[PDB]
Structure 1
Amino acid sequence: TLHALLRDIPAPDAEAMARAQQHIDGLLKPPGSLGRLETLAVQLAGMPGLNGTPQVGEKAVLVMCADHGVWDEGVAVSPKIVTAIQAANMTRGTTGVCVLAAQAGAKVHVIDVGIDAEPIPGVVNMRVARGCGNIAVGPAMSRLQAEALLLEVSRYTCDLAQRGVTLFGVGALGMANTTPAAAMVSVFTGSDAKEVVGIGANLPPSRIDNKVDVVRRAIAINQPNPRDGIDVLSKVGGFDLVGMTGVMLGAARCGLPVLLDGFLSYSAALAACQIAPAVRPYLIPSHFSAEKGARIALAHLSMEPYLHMAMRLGEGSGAALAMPIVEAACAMFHNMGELAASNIVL
């Protein structure tokens, strides 16, 4: 039902947004003084799954895990098995995103969408294959596979709204995944690879040329169509990137907010917004990733992150870190007194 899913993403609710603006202007402060807390509160009020008001109930960070055949091109200094080890660490609460999610009172959902290892007990199993194809020589997956994964993850995501989740975050875990992320960013924005290829997980300065060349080769051989984000995902993305796009389609379909993380997630967000522009009003940035291509990706999303933390972990820890800011916008909205009640005219 993918066509129906995309078709049925709701528009933001202009009426609820006008009522929200009106309330904010009347609060106990100079009009506009809380800046982007104000604009964030109105954006949230517009999302139909929030029931006409900025609010946060339960929070979930979905961490999408997979391996990538492009690891064989020597674009990642972390050994391949780190994806599987770290995915298992997610079930024990010891990773960055686990710790930051706990701090924010969010639950982490670890989803294996294609790790090249035995299944990890405890991890949600949506595995497409044991790793995707090497994008340097051919596609990451078939279109059927990318579509099926989008539908499954989007259904999983919107189903969490039944258990009270009203705010998602997304992240990805997959050795070498900054390579397809950079291929996709280059394709969607028209920037040359050299401008959007970063060091990812501490790649030595001397291997950057190889990684730029591998991105260009992937684009050259696959010839992804920039106007078909599912084509771009299936050809030069990865299962974890498709997985993050699926969380965004599902949150949007559910009329609910989703916090981006870093560059991996911006690449997925570019795909999501190409596939269904109606996704865009549900997306909330968290932080401004240290990765080279972060600025270019965020400009094409017309997004300005709240947090400048020079972070590049990418598995959702940035999204978790911004959940308190969303909660702060709701608290301001609901808990502030009003000017009129103090007799103050400004």
Structure 2
Amino acid sequence: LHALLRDIPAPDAEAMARTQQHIDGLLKPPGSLGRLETLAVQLAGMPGLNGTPQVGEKAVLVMCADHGVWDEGVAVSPKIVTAIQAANMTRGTTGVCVLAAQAGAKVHVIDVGIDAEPIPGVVNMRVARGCGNIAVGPAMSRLQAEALLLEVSRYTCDLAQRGVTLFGVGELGMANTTPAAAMVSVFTGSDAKEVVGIGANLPPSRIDNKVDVVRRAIAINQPNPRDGIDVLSKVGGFDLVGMTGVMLGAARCGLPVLLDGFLSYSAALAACQIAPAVRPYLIPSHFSAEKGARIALAHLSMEPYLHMAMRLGEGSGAALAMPIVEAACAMFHNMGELAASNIVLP
């Protein structure tokens, strides 16, 4: 693992400089394509993309797991919805399945801790049947967190060897906006009330309890904010750990990763805390409607491309943004050049 984190490649400044020069010469006023140009340069800096903004195969990894804190009354969805929805993922009927298909991406359903029997068709990497209730203790041990990190990391970069050049990250797990809020509170240093949201339609009357639970998880576990792995293992969850692992794996592989919503933001905070070298490989997708989204994004210093008020999860936002990444590549490789049309602009 330490080896893994040590070998994460830095961005290729040489390719980035060649990228900028080429973009500036395209048939358009310099900088007129804004963030689409900035995106193309970012991609060209990623060693796995072979010195140029390109997109081969696309995959969306969905980490599924249950949480013990569900028993604290912080989620109104029946706990079995995690297992049922994970099954539907294999039938291509879920939101991410439909949005991925539209983007020509393949969805990978990974079970990292669903509290139910194994689901055939789903990748089995389950640590246990749900994580511990963070309200009364840790969600898992440090070893378990590190093991899943390494496991997911390997799985991700292994896909790269099969032609995948762009990843999307996602999750599925009733009650996960609670540990996510806890993680965001710890990493950003914001009060719990400022980052706890409604999750999957939690009644306004039940918010207070959710906030108290988050505070309790922090007070009792005392997670160290300067140790991402310590935070993940204490007030996190299997699914959150898994998303963090996809991010480390893709970074080590020198490939881009599209974030999704609020849950992904907390995993990104952990990942950047564990290995800052991961930041250059992260690409935002949409701005989640979850209350703590703004705060999380600011500390990540990210500005989402899509404002859809979405709050579904599954990596649905990620899939929705994939066409945008391909547009930056198409812009780069297919546009004509000013010099060719004898056009001279200041």
Q: TM-score range by the shorter chain?
A: over 0.9
The equivalent of 2:221 in structure 1 is 222
Alpha-carbon deviation of 1:12?
A: 0.2
Within the alignment, does 1:270 sit opposite 2:241 as a pair? no
Counterpart-to-counterpart distance in 2, 1:119 and 1:292: 34
Cα deviation, 1:136-169, whole Å, max 9, x if unaligned, reads 0000000000000000000000000011000000
Distance 1:240 1:159 in 2: 19
* Residue 44 (str. 1) matches residue 14 (str. 2): no
Distance 2:72 2:120 in 1: 30
Aligned to 2:240: 241
Distance 1:327 1:270 in 2: 26
How far apart are 1:244 and its partner, in Å?
A: 0.1
5+ residue gaps, structure 1? none
Q: Structure 1, residues 156-188: CA drift from partner, whole Å, max 9, x if none?
A: 000000110000000110000000000000000
In the TM superposition, residue 285 of structure 1 has moved relative to its aligned partner by 0.2
Q: Separation in 1 of the partners of 2:14 and 2:256? A: 18
* Partner Cα separation in structure 2 for residue 266 and residue 256 of structure 1: 18
Q: Deviations over 1:48-80 (max 9, x none)?
A: 000000000000000000000000000000000
When the two chains are superposed, the root-mean-square deviation of aligned CA atoms in Å is 0.3
- 1:301 shift after superposition: 0.3
Give the distance between the partners of 1:117 and 1:146, measured in 2 at CA. Answer: 20
CA distance in 1, matches of 2:47, 2:312: 31
Deviation above 6 Å: which 4+ runs of structure 1? none
SS for the counterpart of 1:163 is: coil
TM-score (norm 2): 1.00
Unaligned runs of 5+ in 2: none
Instruction: Provide, for residues 85-130 of structure 1, a one-character-per-residue CA deviation record: whole Å limited to 9, x for no partner.
Output: 0000000000000000000000000000000000000000000000
Render the CA deviation track for 1:216-250: whole Å, top value 9, x for unaligned: 00000000000000000000000000000000000
1:230 counterpart SS class: helix
Cα distance, 1:343 vs structure 2: 0.5
Aligned-pair CA distance for 1:259 = 0.2
**Whole-angstrom CA distance in 1 between matches of 2:320 and 2:173:** 21
Aligned to 2:96: 97
What is the match of residue 140 of structure 1? Answer: 139
Alpha-carbon shift at residue 297 of structure 1 (Å): 0.2
Distance in 2 (CA, whole Å) between partners of 1:91 and 1:4 is 34
TM-aligned CA deviation for residue 292 of structure 1: 0.1
Q: How does 1:117-156 map to 2 (within 5 A)?
A: 117-156=116-155
TM-superposed deviation, 1:314 = 1.2
2:291 is matched with 292
Instruction: After superposition, give the CA deviation of every residue in 1:228-285 in whole Å (9 maximum; x if it has no partner).
Output: 0000000000000000000000000000000000000000000000000000000000
Q: Secondary structure at the match of 1:256?
A: coil
- Structure 1 residue matching 2:170: 3-state secondary structure: strand
Q: Does the residue aligned with 2:161 lie in a helix, a strand or coil?
A: helix
**Aligned equivalents of 2:264, 2:312: Cα separation in 1:** 11
The secondary structure found in structure 2 opposite 1:113 is strand
Helix, strand or coil at the partner of 1:221: helix
> Distance in 2 between the 1:169 and 1:182 partners?
21
1:301-324, Cα deviation, whole Å (9 max, x unpaired): 000000000000111000000000
3-state SS of paired residue (2:147): helix
Matching residue of 2:173: 174
Q: Residues 4-61 of structure 1: CA distance to partner in whole angstroms, max 9, x if unpaired?
A: 0000000000000000000000000000000000000000000000000000000000
Aligned length: 345
Q: TM-score, normalised by structure 1?
A: 1.00
**Percent of residue pairs identical:** 99
For residues 149 and 73 of structure 1, the distance between their equivalents in structure 2, rounded to whole angstroms, comes to 26
Could you tell me how far apart the structure 2 residues matched to 1:202 and 1:91 are? 25
